[PDB]
Design a protein around this ligand. Structure first.
Ligand code: CLA
Ligand code: CLA
Ligand code: CLA
Ligand code: CLA
Ligand code: CLA
Ligand code: CLA
Ligand code: CLA
Ligand code: CLA
Ligand code: CLA
Ligand SMILES: CCCCCCCCCCCCCCCC(=O)OC[C@H](COP(=O)(O)OC[C@@H](O)CO)OC(=O)CCCCCCCCCCCCCCC
Lengths: 40, 80, 743, 174, 160, 172
């Protein structure tokens, strides 16, 4: 477990997870609040 | 042909003279360093300009500097 | 005891996640830790170079076997996904009912951000991206009929993927074979040539004879897919098969007896293409695989194993020596049984060469139902396999050079063929250089001559079919030979192997599937250009292999390695003198070569083959036959091909083909981006980085992993990578977009 | 001891020992990765806020302040909109000034329990106007804290339920 | 109006674009039929299109002759939603990321292995440091006036 | 000769323990590749699910249903309940709660493997049945579970297959 957590703490892995999360939240925002070119 | 100069920062590691592909460098007696030896360039007429020597120097800045210059058959490595 | 035995070590490597948390464990140097950004890049570049990670062939060998299982697992998952996507996200059922109208589609995009436009109205009450891999045609030939079957093959794929992955772990961590096991070429060839290929073909023939052939006959006749009996029904009720093929009634009795003629119903040598589907008759394909199976199985009994009879490859190789070749093929056996790189070289070159052959043979002799009329799929497959082939061929050369620098031993190679080759390398390279110049000057000169003449208002002085003409007489002759073969040199055949050589126009759905392809002056000119491109590629690559260890310029290149940046600014300049650099340059020429070939295919077909034919004999080709008088000049290619056939991509915005337009532009960008890595040097970049780092330091922060510029070699690699991606990507979109429209 | 009370099948989470509402419930080991003091403070704060929110969510539906008497929304979830962004922001901004004041600028995870406030008892601000915790035994004080925590945990779950109930059901809670 | 533009609510070109767009989708839907999954999708798409144009119409966006919205960024607060307000968002988020990053690097710089903690991040510490960036504006200013942000010529420089 | 009781013609598999339900029946020797405790947990989990499943499937078919039935949820057989529950949302509810429990179970299994001392499948809830009883009876009860669990797997498998194969009343 400890060792696996270290692998999951490696730079490449963390970047992918973080970017996936970031991408996801951006996509989700556009799904519910779509087509915005300004704050209204 | 090319010009090779050695500076006082040499430490007599002998690495440069062991890397020259054409025996241009030698290790001569000296007292400025603990090793008691310094490098010399007695036969620069055979330098091809490889700069392998510089790549081997351990000093902060190369104690052995090769300045490329006039070119001859020997310096241009022409077997023909 | 036995010459061939199984030796395996139990529990060789413990399974744990410790090494996973220690990046760079494989290397002694990298293991120490990161001090500069170079460490990161080196980690990824030395990951699969097992030879440098260990000094024992056994260990290297063990890793390779397991790694291969991993690739197989990935491939299985890939195939599984395709079948699943064809079961849940496709219009196969509708297409199956009306193959001519409905367009194949197996990918659907989520309705996010207007990307839905990409979901086209393919047909069959379905909206999705039109795929071009040819899955639907293959499935029809197999006799899938339902989408439930596709689901099950998908499940099988997933299962198989898992089995392979387990095998990899098992044969590396629990039961690792020893070197003696690996070094059994005769046994391996016997097994692979009789079991993998022979039994494989025989098994496939069984499926084709008992399941595919019957179902496809019913489909072609007109029976609705739902009305066709399930596959198992055919296997059980012999009477049903007898109705379709009236020989199954006799059973296997004719086979055990010598009367193989009775099976002429399903085993035939018809030749040509099925008029209804526009594909090769499955009966012929069944006989094909059956015949090949017998051949392979027999061939698998040629090498000695543990029963005395057979051949020993070493003896065969050593016996073949002559007056002009010294010791002959002595020493080769040891090389190929003690060097993985050497084996990869030969194997990789042959694999790539096969792909190129597949591309040619698969368009002239369409193998699947309803494939020829689908121009998009045809173009996609030809180009795809042409590329895969080029890369593999260049790769073979690369690994060949790695052998010379890492595994070649002068002692084991005295006066053998290899030694003698390296002893007259100057002659070989000198002559090839001339051949390349000759071909290049004459071949390309023809085009430049014509351009000048047409521009100067002197059309009568051009090398054209209407002026000075350069006809491909030899090829024209072979075509006639092949056309008249059926009934003469091939008495039992009924038609030409391909209608390309000659014959009638096969049309399916009002569209031309195949037609005689004629060869004239333009064809002569282009074919010779292909020769020039290939020859130059060989020059660069061969020079790299022959001069890998030494040269008059750098007598000790071997010690420097296979991938060194240079030897220095001396000797007038020694930049890019490694064998790796020769491969680097070879890839650029391979790109050029393949690009011209695929363009030839695209224009020739759209001009002299593809098109529509009326109920009466009126053939209208897509481009109108412009190839003859326009492909003889460079301006013609720029105007009548690139400029005109690119009208689709550039005008794709607002349509389901918009993606291709965006990718076309994106690829151009990446191609240009690469030119900054290919023209610049590390020095400028390193100095720039210094100034940037100053800023970070001025604000009291800077990375301990000191930022450094990419190595000389990496710079070149990054440049080549982006260059290739951009160039190939651009054509990819260009072709696909154009094809969708023409189809 | 070696096994947690709440999860008899799991090893007892240390650092979760001897605290006010400890039942050994820390399956994911947040108490090891992060500081216990911050966690304790956060729990108490969340609880107190949730308590108030729950009460308000119920009250607004039936009674409105004189100022907002004109605008009455039973859904409560729709109240934020009717009141206005400015009013909402005034409340949040004012909360900020008060948070800063109370913590004296130590408002980050790296400073809240450092320096002078390094000895601060999580959740203690010294707010006892009624002085009902006067001259009470340590035990009594502790039992009182337990009550706050337990009621707080309940409120945290309750408020979420109320809000999401209205979202799903579509109408006022009552 | 500013620059001779016209409000999109009052631009005929804008409306023409809307009608045309919807028509295209509707024409496609005609081929499919009734509750066919394809038709329902196209129908939903037209709703989104109508909504988008409506939103822009109710906005303060100014359209040009082409009937396309044009943004104003000269500092006027009348059109702050177009650039100024969104701009603050970027600055806040970007500063947050930069500040927290610098903090972590400086924090792990004094560790046993300062380079191992850059390739294998200490997630627990990182998360703590990341949360403390919401007040980056204040912290940064405080660090500047404390002579702890900008260094003082004790940094490596080129030979010349 | 260390022969498996179940298979008198085969050597008893090593790597196995002497715990309840150990009759030496591991012809394929899965135990060699995977820790025994993990396997024991799996056996119990599969069986305990099957035991419960059998009861539910049968009862629903027999007629025992929640009185305030949801939309539909009437004129529906066990064979057809899954989809109905999915659309109603019952399956989602179950999946959510079950998955949450599995998460905690994951933590449990890891600790067990690391040496926490947790007996495979033991979560602590005994209803007081094991309270006070000695190992003898404790083990006896455990064995009885195991037997029931193994039998249950056969039972559930049969009921489902038969039912779908032959749509009909409880006794298929
Ligand atoms: C359009 C760009 C272009 C052109 C024309 C060439 C031309 C050539 N390259 Mg080259 N190359 C290029 C781009 C180009 N390269 C790029 C981008 C790269 C980077 C990867 C390389 C990398 C590269 C390598 C690594 C190699 C070449 C080689 C060659 C030569 C092939 C021999 C040959 O056909 O001679 C004929 C050359 C011609 C230009 C033919 C046209 C000339 C006319 C039509 C023929 C008649 C003219 C007559 C001789 C004189 C007329 C007199 C009057 C005009 C003054 C040739 C000089 C190979 C070589 O040198 O081996 C022989 C080789 O090894 N190239
Ligand atoms: C060659 C393999 C392949 C490829 C390229 C695709 C590609 C695609 N599939 Mg598909 N599929 C495949 C195999 C494949 N599939 C197989 C084998 C199955 C059977 C299980 C399926 C079943 C399937 C379904 C059921 C669906 C798709 C869908 C899709 C599309 C959306 C993909 C998606 O989920 O995006 C979004 C991606 C995600 C949601 C995944 C999240 C990203 C993860 C978290 C990043 C990875 C984390 C990283 C690895 C961490 C590393 C940790 C370390 C231990 C390694 C996409 C075109 C979807 C679709 O088309 O809908 C219309 C869809 O519904 N596929
Ligand atoms: C979960 C099971 C498991 C575990 C714990 C290990 C553990 C280990 N293996 Mg092992 N292995 C496994 C499964 C496993 N293996 C399987 C299934 C195979 C067959 C493919 C192998 C094949 C294998 C080889 C050939 C080698 C190891 C080695 C090692 C050791 C070093 C770890 C390492 O190199 O990091 C690797 C960590 C990674 C994250 C690499 C994953 C790369 C992925 C798979 C690429 C594909 C991803 C994607 C699909 C492609 C791009 C998109 C370590 C003891 C090495 C060793 O030290 O030997 C002495 C070694 O040489 N293993
Ligand atoms: C008749 C026996 C037999 C067969 C079928 C194979 C087949 C194969 N060997 Mg192989 N091998 C054999 C004997 C055999 N070997 C012997 C005796 C030796 C020792 C001298 C080796 C040593 C050896 C090495 C060292 C390597 C191979 C590799 C390979 C694979 C090459 C990749 C390929 O074509 O993918 C085709 C892929 C498939 C067809 C997928 C299916 C693969 C499974 C394993 C087929 C097994 C039979 C299957 C269950 C069908 C049963 C019939 C039943 C349904 C009625 C291929 C699967 C290479 C590899 O990649 O291995 C991982 C490799 O590096 N072999
Ligand atoms: C059967 C196929 C095969 C196999 C098994 C190998 C195996 C090997 N090759 Mg080899 N090679 C092959 C084919 C193959 N090659 C081909 C076809 C070429 C020609 C291009 C080469 C060219 C080549 C060179 C020039 C070199 C090797 C080297 C090596 C060795 C180390 C590989 C390495 O560094 O791993 C690490 C692998 C990688 C870093 C590859 C990662 C993928 C990169 C990033 C490209 C990805 C492109 C991607 C598809 C684009 C996606 C676009 C998208 C993002 C939009 C190893 C023995 C090297 C060596 O030292 O040998 C001893 C070496 O110098 N090979
Ligand atoms: C989480 C805390 C919280 C939040 C964010 C809100 C938010 C809101 N409330 Mg509200 N409320 C709360 C708690 C809260 N309330 C509590 C605990 C009560 C019970 C007293 C009420 C009673 C209440 C009524 C009666 C009304 C609102 C209204 C509103 C809305 C207008 C805001 C306004 O000016 O009056 C809200 C503020 C107050 C009424 C006074 C201050 C809020 C505190 C928390 C209540 C008592 C103060 C004290 C701290 C709590 C106990 C006292 C103790 C210290 C002795 C707004 C959405 C109005 C509405 O519906 O708008 C249309 C309205 O008419 N609330
Ligand atoms: C379940 C309710 C509850 C309970 C039992 C407590 C209990 C406690 N709080 Mg407390 N608190 C609560 C809710 C509660 N709080 C809420 C909702 C807030 C946010 C406004 C706070 C904010 C707060 C602060 C800022 C501080 C305390 C402190 C304390 C401790 C000493 C003060 C005291 O005697 O309080 C007695 C409390 C009660 C008897 C609760 C009565 C609740 C009635 C029923 C509601 C009446 C509301 C109405 C408007 C008033 C009339 C004590 C353990 C102090 C502390 O930790 O010092 C050690 C301290 O500094 N509390
Ligand atoms: C050099 C170019 C330049 C720059 C840097 C600015 C900068 C600014 N303008 Mg501006 N402006 C410019 C050219 C420029 N303007 C031109 C050419 C025009 C005429 C079209 C305007 C018309 C304009 C208006 C009408 C307003 C600003 C305002 C502002 C300020 C934004 C409000 C704030 O607090 O910040 C800011 C100082 C606003 C301002 O002063 O707010 C108090 C404001 O209302 N500007
Ligand atoms: C494998 C487990 C399992 C699964 C997946 C399902 C799944 C389903 N059941 Mg079902 N059921 C099960 C076991 C299971 N049941 C058992 C064991 C019983 C016996 C009481 C029932 C009795 C039952 C009835 C009476 C009805 C369903 C119904 C349904 C469907 C809707 C869900 C529902 O109403 O649940 C309701 C489930 C129950 C009321 C079962 C209650 C069992 C007790 C209360 C729990 C005992 C806990 C135990 C003492 C200790 C364990 C604690 C902890 C480990 C969880 C759905 C297909 C409904 C349906 O399909 O209608 C058409 C329906 O009316 N089930
Ligand atoms: C090509 C004709 C041919 O095959 O000759 C083959 C010629 C004679 O080969 P030998 O019979 O003497 O040697 C036999 C062994 O190589 C095994 O076949 O070998 C050469 O010397 C080739 C010279 C370079 C090729 C010139 C171009």
């Amino acid at each position: 477990m400890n060792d696996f957590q270290k692998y999951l703490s490696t730079a490449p892995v963390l970047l992918t997870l973080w970017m996936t999360f970031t991408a996801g939240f951006i996509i989700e925002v556009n799904r519910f609040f779509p087509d915005m070119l300004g704050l209204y | 042909s090319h010009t090779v100069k050695i500076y006082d920062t040499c430490i007599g590691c002998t690495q440069c003279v062991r890397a020259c592909p054409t025996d241009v460098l030698e290790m001569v007696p000296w007292d400025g360093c603990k090793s008691g030896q310094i490098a010399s360039s007695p036969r620069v007429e055979d330098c091809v300009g490889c700069k392998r020597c510089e790549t081997a120097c351990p000093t902060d800045f190369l104690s052995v500097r090769v300045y490329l210059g006039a070119e001859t058959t020997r310096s241009l490595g022409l077997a023909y | 005891s036995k010459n061939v035995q199984v030796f395996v070590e139990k529990d060789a490597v413990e399974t744990s996640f410790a090494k996973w948390a220690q990046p760079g464990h494989f290397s002694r140097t990298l293991a120490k830790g990161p001090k500069t950004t170079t460490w990161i890049w080196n980690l990824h570049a030395d990951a699969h170079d097992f030879d440098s990670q260990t000094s024992s062939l056994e260990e290297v060998s063990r890793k390779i076997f397991s790694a291969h299982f991993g690739q197989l697992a990935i491939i299985f998952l890939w195939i599984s996904g395709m079948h699943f996507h064809g079961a849940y996200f496709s219009n196969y059922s509708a297409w199956l009912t009306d193959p001519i109208s409905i367009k194949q589609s197996s990918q659907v995009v989520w309705p996010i951000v207007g990307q839905e436009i990409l979901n086209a109205d393919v047909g069959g009450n379905f909206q999705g991206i039109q795929t071009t891999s040819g899955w639907f045609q293959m499935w029809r030939a197999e006799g899938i009929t339902s989408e439930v079957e596709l689901y099950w093959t998908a499940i099988g794929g997933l299962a198989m993927s898992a089995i392979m992955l387990f095998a990899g772990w098992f044969h590396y961590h629990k039961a690792a074979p020893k070197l003696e096991w690996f070094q059994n070429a005769e046994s391996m060839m016997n097994h692979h040539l009789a079991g993998l290929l022979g039994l494989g073909c025989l098994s496939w023939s069984g499926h084709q004879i008992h399941i595919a052939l019957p179902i496809n006959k019913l489909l072609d006749a007109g029976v609705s897919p739902q009305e066709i009996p399930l596959p198992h029904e055919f296997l059980i009720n012999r009477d049903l098969m007898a109705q379709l093929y009236p020989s199954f009634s006799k059973g296997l009795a004719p086979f055990f007896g010598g009367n193989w003629g009775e099976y002429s119903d399903f085993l035939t040598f018809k030749g040509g293409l099925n008029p209804v589907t526009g594909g090769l008759w499955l009966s012929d394909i069944a006989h094909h695989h059956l015949a090949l199976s017998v051949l392979f199985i027999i061939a698998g009994h040629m090498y000695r194993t543990n029963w005395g009879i057979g051949h020993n490859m070493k003896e065969i190789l050593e016996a073949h020596k002559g007056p002009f070749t010294g010791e002959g093929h002595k020493g080769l056996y040891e090389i190929l049984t003690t060097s993985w790189h050497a084996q990869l070289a030969i194997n990789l070159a042959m694999m790539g060469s096969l792909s190129i052959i597949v591309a040619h043979h698969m368009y002239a002799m369409p193998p699947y139902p309803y494939l020829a009329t689908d121009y998009a799929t045809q173009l996609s497959l030809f180009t795809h396999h042409m590329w895969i082939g080029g890369f593999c061929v260049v790769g073979g050369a690369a690994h060949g050079a790695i052998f010379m620098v890492r595994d070649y031993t002068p002692a084991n190679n005295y006066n053998n063929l290899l030694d003698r080759v390296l002893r007259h390398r100057d002659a070989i390279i000198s002559h090839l250089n001339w051949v390349c110049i000759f071909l290049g000057c004459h071949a390309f000169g023809f085009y430049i001559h014509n351009d000048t003449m047409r521009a100067l208002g002197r059309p009568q002085d051009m090398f054209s079919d209407k002026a000075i003409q350069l006809q491909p007489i030899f090829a024209q002759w072979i075509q006639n030979i092949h056309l008249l073969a059926p009934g003469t040199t091939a008495p039992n055949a009924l038609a030409t192997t391909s209608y390309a050589f000659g014959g009638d126009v096969i049309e399916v759905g009002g569209k031309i599937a195949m037609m005689p392809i004629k060869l004239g002056t333009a064809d002569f000119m282009v074919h010779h250009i292909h020769a020039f491109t290939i020859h130059v590629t060989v020059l660069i690559l061969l020079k790299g292999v022959l001069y890998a260890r030494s040269s008059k310029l750098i007598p000790d290149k071997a010690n420097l390695g296979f991938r060194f940046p240079c030897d220095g600014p001396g000797r007038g300049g020694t930049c890019q003198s490694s064998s790796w650099d020769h491969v680097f340059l070879g890839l650029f020429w391979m790109y050029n070569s393949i690009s011209v070939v695929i363009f030839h295919f695209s224009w020739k077909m759209q001009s002299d083959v593809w098109g529509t034919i009326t109920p009466d004999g009126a053939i209208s080709h897509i481009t109108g036959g412009n190839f003859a008088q326009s492909s003889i000049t460079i301006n013609g290619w720029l105007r009548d091909f690139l400029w005109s056939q690119a009208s689709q991509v550039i005008q794709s915005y607002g349509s389901a083909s918009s993606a291709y337009g965006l990718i076309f532009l994106g690829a151009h960008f990446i191609w240009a981006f690469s030119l900054m890595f290919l023209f610049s040097g590390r020095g400028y970049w390193q100095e720039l980085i210094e100034s940037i780092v100053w800023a970070h330091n001025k604000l009291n922060f800077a990375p301990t992993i000191q930022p450094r510029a990419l190595s000389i070699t990496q710079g070149r690699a990054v440049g080549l990578a982006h260059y290739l991606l951009g160039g190939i990507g651009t054509t990819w979109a260009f072709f696909l977009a154009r094809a969708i429209s023409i189809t | 001891a070696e096994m947690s009370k709440a999860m008899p099948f799991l090893i007892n989470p240390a650092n979760t020992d001897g605290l006010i509402g400890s039942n050994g419930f820390d399956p994911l080991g947040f108490s090891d990765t992060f500081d216990i003091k911050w966690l304790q403070e956060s729990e108490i704060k969340h609880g107190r806020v949730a308590m108030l929110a729950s009460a308000g969510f119920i009250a607004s539906q039936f009674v409105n302040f004189p100022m907002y008497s004109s605008m009455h929304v039973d859904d409560s979830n729709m109240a934020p909109t009717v009141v206005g962004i400015s009013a909402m922001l005034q409340i949040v901004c004012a909360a900020g000034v008060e948070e800063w004041r109370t913590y004296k600028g130590q408002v980050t995870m790296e400073d809240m329990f450092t320096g002078d406030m390094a000895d601060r008892t999580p959740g203690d601000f010294g707010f006892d106007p009624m002085g009902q915790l006067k001259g009470k035994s340590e035990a009594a004080v502790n039992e009182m804290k337990l009550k706050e925590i337990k009621n707080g945990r309940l409120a945290m779950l309750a408020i979420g339920g109320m809000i999401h109930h209205n979202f799903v059901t579509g109408e006022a809670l009552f | 109006e500013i620059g001779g533009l016209t409000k999109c609510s009052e631009s005929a070109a804008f409306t023409k674009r809307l009608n045309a767009s919807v028509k295209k989708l509707e024409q496609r839907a005609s081929q499919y039929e009734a509750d066919s999954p394809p038709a329902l999708a196209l129908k939903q798409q037209v709703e989104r299109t109508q909504a988008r144009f409506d939103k822009y119409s109710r906005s303060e966006l100014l359209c040009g002759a082409d009937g396309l919205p044009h943004l104003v960024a000269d500092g006027r607060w009348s059109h702050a939603a177009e650039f100024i307000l969104p701009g603050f968002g970027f600055i806040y988020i970007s500063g947050w990321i930069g500040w927290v990053g610098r903090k972590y690097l400086r924090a792990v710089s004094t560790s046993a292995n300062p380079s191992e903690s850059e390739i294998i991040i200490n997630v627990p510490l990182a998360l703590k440091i990341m949360t403390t960036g919401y007040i980056w504006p204040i912290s940064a200013w405080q660090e500047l006036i404390s002579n702890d942000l900008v260094a003082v010529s004790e940094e490596i420089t080129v030979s010349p | 000769a260390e022969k498996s009781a179940s298979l008198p013609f085969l050597e008893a598999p090593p790597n196995l323990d002497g715990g309840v339900g150990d009759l030496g029946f591991d012809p394929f020797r899965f135990s060699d590749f995977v820790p025994i405790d993990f396997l024991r947990e799996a056996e119990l989990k599969h069986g305990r699910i099957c035991m419960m499943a059998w009861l539910g499937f049968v009862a629903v078919d027999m007629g025992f249903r929640v009185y305030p039935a949801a939309e539909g949820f009437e004129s529906l057989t066990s064979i057809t309940a899954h989809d109905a529950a999915v659309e109603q949302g019952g399956m989602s509810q179950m999946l959510l709660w079950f998955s949450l429990l599995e998460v905690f179970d994951t933590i449990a299994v890891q600790q067990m493997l690391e040496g926490s001392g947790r007996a495979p499948g033991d979560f602590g809830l005994d209803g007081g049945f094991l309270k006070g009883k000695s190992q003898a009876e404790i083990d006896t009860m455990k064995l009885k579970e195991i037997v029931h669990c193994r039998l249950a797997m056969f039972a559930f498998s049969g009921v489902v297959t038969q039912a779908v194969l032959t749509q009909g009343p409880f006794p298929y």
